[PDB]
Every structure is written in structure tokens, then in C-alpha cells.
Amino acid sequence: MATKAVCVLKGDGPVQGIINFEQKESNGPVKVWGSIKGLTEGLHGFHVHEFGDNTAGCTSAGPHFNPLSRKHGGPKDEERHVGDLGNVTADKDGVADVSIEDSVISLSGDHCIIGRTLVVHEKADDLGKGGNEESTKTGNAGSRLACGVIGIAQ
Amino acid sequence: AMATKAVCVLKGDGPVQGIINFEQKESNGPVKVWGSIKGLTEGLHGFHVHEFGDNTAGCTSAGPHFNPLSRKHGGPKDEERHVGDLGNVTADKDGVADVSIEDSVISLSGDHCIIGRTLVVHEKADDLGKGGNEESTKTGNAGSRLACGVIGIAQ
């Protein structure tokens, strides 16, 4: 069983980075950390999307990974997609030093994210609190700036 | 036992690029592998699944051929082969390999699952273990990694 995974994020613009995933126990939380650069200062939606398909760029990754067919939420919510990792924050130099721990994604089993796509978005994820239909689907986080397939790591 | 389709976008430092599809209708049946890879020199090119889906150093960080049974390198029809030994693909005079392979050793689920690992197309022919040196029973002498991608779950 995989205990480590990695994702190289690339897109059409300047946004790029490397995100690592580590999971001590298949029961336990996944630590997610790494650095993304080229971003506008502030919050960006950060999600695992369902398909590891980059054939038409980030668009072919499909919607948020949601095998329990829930509504969109933030990572602390009981009602959330498996792929709802919330936001990451870029500093004034355009750098997000990502550091998240999450107990809903996994590197094995039904919630396994290996082979799916990590995407960093154009705008803040509103965490399902925007009071419109789109908030309960995508969090209003806008365009996909960069993405990559999550792969098994050594 | 749940993924029935996968996809891989191959890219590299040169002109080689392609899209490869994988389909496995039954979890205990074969995987069909097909697609098109352009920018290749005419002739045979090694075509392998490497162990790690790690592209942080481009194709180099993918590590060696995926080989969970710790066998020696072979061709896909050999009993003695790596799980990742898919043989060669052939590029035509226009630089295009129209890949079409069916393999019963790789899978899209369980322990031979290649989801999340890296598909690489190589510079030269894979000699299928028959080259009479130790590099032959490790990599098939297929030489450098021209393009690669992580194999992802597809719709």
C-alpha cells in the first residue's frame, strides 16, 4: 500500500509547483505539503478532481472528486466532497507554502486520490457559504490555473 | 477492482508527445492499450511502465521498470518479465506510433495496478532481454527516456 504520493502542477500560465502527500497509516490523515509559485497574493481554491485526465489540460480532470455525492464544503465540514481541501494562501511574492492535514482524502481505499488530478484555482473557495448553486458545486473558486496527476512516490 | 479506464499524456524535453488510453472491461481480464505518439524517429521504441508516478525530475524520477515480482526484464510475451514490460512500439515514416497493445500482466486494479505510475517511451528498441549484457536483463537497452506521463483514472 502507498504511503507517499507526489503531484507536479503545471498550467498555461506561470503557476507551477510540487505537492507531496504522506500517509503514515491507511486509517489516518494525509499530510499535504509543498510549494506553488506564480500565484496572485491571497486565497486560491485547492481541490482534488475526479479524473487523472490531462488530455485537454485541466478541464478534462472533471468535477471535484465526490464519490459520496455530497455538496461542496470546506475541509472541516461533514458535508463536503472528498476532494475539498479548501484554500491555500500565496504570499506577496506569489508563493503558497502549502501545509494541510486532511482525514477524508486517502492514499488507499475508496477515497484514494492516486491517479486523480490536483488543481489550484484562480480565486478563493467560498467553502460552500456563498448562498448560490455554484457555491454548493465548486465553491465559486473560478478557473483552473495549474493541475497534475497524483502519482505514487518513493 | 473499480477503474475500467485510464489515460496518460506523454510529454518530454524534445518533440515526442502522445496520448495513450487503457481499458480493462473485466478486473480479471486483459488491458487494452492504444493511442498515438508523434515526434519519434522511425522504427522501434521501448515502451514501459516505470515504478513511480513522480515527474519532479521529469522522466528520470519515475525510477526503474515496475517490477513488484522482482523478475528480470523480458518482452511482454515472456514468463520472465517485469509487470511494466510492454515491449516496443513502432513509429512509421512520419514519426507516428499508432499504439495498439493488449496485455494480461498489467492491470488497472489490485497489486499489478499501474494507475499512478509512469508510462515512458524510450529512445531505442527494447531488446527484450536478449542482448547478452546485464543492461539487457534490467532495461532492455532501450536507452534514454524521451517522454512520459503519470497514468490517471479516466471517465
Ligand SMILES: Oc1ccc([C@@H](O)CNCc2ccc3ccccc3c2)cc1O
Ligand atoms: O497526517 C500525517 C502527518 C504527518 C506525517 C509524517 O509522516 C510526515 N511529515 C511531513 C513532512 C516532512 C518533511 C517536510 C519538509 C519540509 C516541509 C514540510 C514537511 C512535512 C504523516 C501523516 O500521515
Ligand SMILES: [Zn+2]
Ligand atoms: Zn468540492
Ligand SMILES: [Zn+2]
Ligand atoms: Zn523491464
